[PDB]
Amino acid sequence: GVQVETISPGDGRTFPKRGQTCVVHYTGMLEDGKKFDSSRDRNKPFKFMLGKQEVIRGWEEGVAQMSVGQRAKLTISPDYAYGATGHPGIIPPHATLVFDVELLKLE
Amino acid sequence: RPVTSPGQHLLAPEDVVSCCLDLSVPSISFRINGCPVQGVFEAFNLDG
């Protein structure tokens, strides 16, 4: 599942609601410490609407608990994540995912 | 190694870190904004 640990606090009052676009920066690492993704390298925030299922379950639930301005570390088990099939080339099977996610805003 | 402190956050402006060294134990301890940091380094080499 999703484990959320606050790196930096947010406002604590605003939380994503269904049908609301979440704009984030993230850096993606495997539990061994290897980085496979970062929106900051592309310099473009990643936008996803909650409840569509664009992102994996781990992102859905973890960002649901986050707040504006909040930076958090999200640990997502394979079940939430791509799982046994994995993401070919990028992610091996049965890989736990660690994400450093900053929720810049909601729109 | 994660350590537990009240109001955990990555070092941010207006934050004061207090570092304490006791060569006798030997131990190194930290306080965050006057609040104890629940972790210590100990049993480390004293070669220098």
Place this chain on the structure above:
Amino acid sequence: LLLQTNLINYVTSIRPNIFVGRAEGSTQYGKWYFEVMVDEVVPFLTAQA
């Protein structure tokens, strides 16, 4: 197996000219205290934190 490439920020260390240690017969006091106050931090000046 293959060599990996990524961009990393440079890091530098600063110390005061205080050196304290323990030795038998030493002239040095064992217990020491100091503080550091953070005026400004930019979390992401680069992609790397």
